[PDB]
Design a protein around this ligand. Structure first.
Ligand SMILES: *[Se]c1ccccc1C(=O)NCc1ccccc1
Ligand SMILES: *[Se]c1ccccc1C(=O)NCc1ccccc1
Ligand SMILES: [Zn+2]
Ligand SMILES: [Zn+2]
Lengths: 153, 153
């Protein structure tokens, strides 16, 4: 009953369309779609705080973290709201995205609408990386593609 | 105290950055920025319903109209929430945008976050055009550039 969408654009082309659906405001969000142009392997996949693409993906700021927590994986209690882990690209450079998440929302204080979805250069270590940056960014590196998260029909 | 931003891009030369700021929860919204690549004259300037850029600006759908009103100009009672009138480009193809609007909002049912800002091919006749489409789209024609409206820092 809430549908939300994001068009990811970045150089490669790294490009993708990610859909979000939430049947009830109390409920999990299904996240699905496709990203192409990626290198094989894991790519960190996050909601960042600002829906600001003024100077590209860097304008989006840090991971969306309304609760002031440390970085983690989506299955961790200690995570940023925006922590959606990794998408995995094959040799064809395509990541088939199929995520269900109970922490992001399409309503309320954890709402992701108007924020930025980013697919990153490297793997997110899901905060298990044992350097300082693991607990902040997951060491997922640069921002390959992003988009502002918008209301869908 | 709330700041929102939109990067306008499309298939041709039209591009811009539009900022929105709302000092008080239900107060007026200041809208300002710059759009270049335009023909001289008026270009319809609207918030459209969907923050969906899947297939370009057409995916944004009709004018944002939560109150089921007819199309009008920003200074009309009978308007869509998304009706921000026209921006005016000079011979250089630059429109300097400076708008204050009391109907849009950055919170609540009138909130434009997650929706799409669109700059159009032609003038919006502000519903005074005396054909049927005047009362729906303002006859502003095709969508030159658009962006999803995002939360800013
Ligand atoms: Se997303 C969010 C955050 C705080 C309070 C309300 C909401 C919400 O209801 N989103 C607005 C919306 C409106 C129409 C379609 C989808 C989303
Ligand atoms: Se205003 C609006 C419209 C659609 C979806 C969500 C929201 C919203 O209010 N989100 C919460 C928000 C907005 C601006 C700054 C911080 C948080
Ligand atoms: Zn994080
Ligand atoms: Zn209208």
């Amino acid at each position: 009953a809430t549908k939300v969408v994001c068009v990811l654009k970045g150089d490669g082309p790294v490009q993708g369309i990610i859909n979000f659906e939430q049947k009830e405001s109390n409920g999990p969000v299904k996240v699905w779609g496709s990203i192409k142009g990626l290198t094989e392997g894991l790519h960190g996949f996050h909601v960042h705080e600002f829906g600001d693409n003024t100077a590209g993906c860097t304008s989006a700021g840090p991971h969306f973290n309304p609760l002031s927590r440390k970085h983690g994986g989506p299955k961790d209690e200690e995570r940023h709201v925006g922590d959606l882990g990794n998408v995995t690209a094959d040799k064809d450079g395509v990541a088939d995205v199929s995520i269900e998440d109970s922490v992001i929302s399409l309503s309320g204080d954890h709402c992701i609408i108007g924020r930025t979805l980013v697919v990153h250069e490297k793997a997110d270590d899901l905060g298990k990386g044992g350097n300082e940056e693991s607990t902040k960014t997951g060491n997922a590196g640069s921002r390959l593609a992003c988009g502002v998260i918008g209301i869908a029909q």
